[PDB]
From Swiss-Prot, chain B:
Phosphoserine modified-residue sites: S1, S13
Residues of the full protein shown: 598 to 716 of 718
Gene name for this UniProt entry: MAD1L1
Record-given protein name: Mitotic spindle assembly checkpoint protein MAD1
Disease: Mosaic variegated aneuploidy syndrome 7 with inflammation and tumor predisposition: A form of mosaic variegated aneuploidy syndrome, a severe disorder characterized by mosaic aneuploidies, predominantly trisomies and monosomies, involving multiple different chromosomes and tissues. Affected individuals typically present with severe intrauterine growth retardation and microcephaly. Eye anomalies, mild dysmorphism, variable developmental delay, and a broad spectrum of additional congenital abnormalities and medical conditions may also occur.
Record function comment: Component of the spindle-assembly checkpoint that prevents the onset of anaphase until all chromosomes are properly aligned at the metaphase plate. Forms a heterotetrameric complex with the closed conformation form of MAD2L1 (C-MAD2) at unattached kinetochores during prometaphase, recruits an open conformation of MAD2L1 (O-MAD2) and promotes the conversion of O-MAD2 to C-MAD2, which ensures mitotic checkpoint signaling.
Known partners and oligomeric status: Homodimer. Dimerizes via its N- and C- terminal regions. Heterodimerizes with MAD2L1 in order to form a tetrameric MAD1L1-MAD2L1 core complex. Interacts with the closed conformation form of MAD2L1 (C-MAD2) and open conformation form of MAD2L1 (O-MAD2). It is unclear whether MAD1L1 dimerization promotes the conversion of closed to open conformation of MAD2L1. Formation of a heterotetrameric core complex containing two molecules each of MAD1L1 and of MAD2L1 promotes binding of another molecule of MAD2L1 to each MAD2L1, resulting in a heterohexamer.
Length: 120, 117
C-alpha cells in the first residue's frame, strides 16, 4: 500500500539524518578553521591521527611527509619518533628535553626550517 | 504496522544521536584548541570581524595579547594592542623585513621564554 503516514515518517527520518550530517559539518568546519588559523600564524598544521596522536607539519617542511608526532600523556605531550624527528636530535635535546618546553622546541624548529626554505 | 514501528525507531535513534554528538563535538573542539596551545605556546580565540586573539603561554601580564585579522581567510594582518606596542623590534625584524608571522611568533615565544628564563 501507499500509507500516507509511512511516507511522512520517511521524510521525518530523512530530516533527522540530514540534521545530524549538518551537525557533523559544523564540527568539521570549526576544527578546520582553527587548524587553518594555527597553521597560518604559527606555521604548524596540527592534525589528529588514526591512533589519536597529533601530527604536526610545518609550513616550511623540506620534504613531502616530514612531520612530528606528539601523543597526550591532555595537558602533557610526549614526542614520538619519526623519520623527521631523528634528523632534528639537537633541537630536541636543546629545547624539548633540556629547556623542557614544547613551544620553545617548535619555535626553534620553525626558525631553522624557515632559514632552510630561503637558501639558494 | 511493522514499518511504522521501524521508522519511528529510526527517528528516535537519530534524535538521541544528535544530542550525544553535540556533547562530544563541543568537548573535542575545546580539546583541539588546548592541544594547539600546549604545543605552539599560543592560545587562539576566534573572534568577530575575522579576528584571532592570541595569548602566549609565557605572557608576562594578564591581558597581554596579540590580535590578527584575516583580510577575508588566508592573508593575516597584525592589529595593534597595548602588548604589540612593546615588541616593535620583533615586528620590524620578522613582519616588516621577513613577512613571516610564523617567524615572528616563534621569535616572540623564545623572547618571552627568556624573560622568565
Amino acid at each position: 500500500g501507499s500509507s500516507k503516514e509511512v511516507a511522512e515518517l520517511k521524510k521525518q527520518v530523512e530530516s533527522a539524518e540530514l540534521k545530524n550530517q549538518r551537525l557533523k559539518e559544523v564540527f568539521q568546519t570549526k576544527i578546520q578553521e582553527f587548524r587553518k588559523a594555527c597553521y597560518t600564524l604559527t606555521g604548524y598544521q596540527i592534525d589528529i591521527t588514526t591512533e589519536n596522536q597529533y601530527r604536526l607539519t610545518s609550513l616550511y617542511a623540506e620534504h613531502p611527509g616530514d612531520c612530528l608526532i606528539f601523543k597526550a600523556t591532555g595537558s602533557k605531550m610526549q614526542l614520538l619518533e619519526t623519520e623527521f624527528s631523528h634528523t632534528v636530535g639537537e633541537l630536541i635535546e636543546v629545547h624539548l628535553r633540556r629547556q623542557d618546553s614544547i613551544p620553545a622546541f617548535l619555535s626553534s624548529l620553525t626558525l631553522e626550517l624557515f632559514s632552510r626554505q630561503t637558501v639558494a
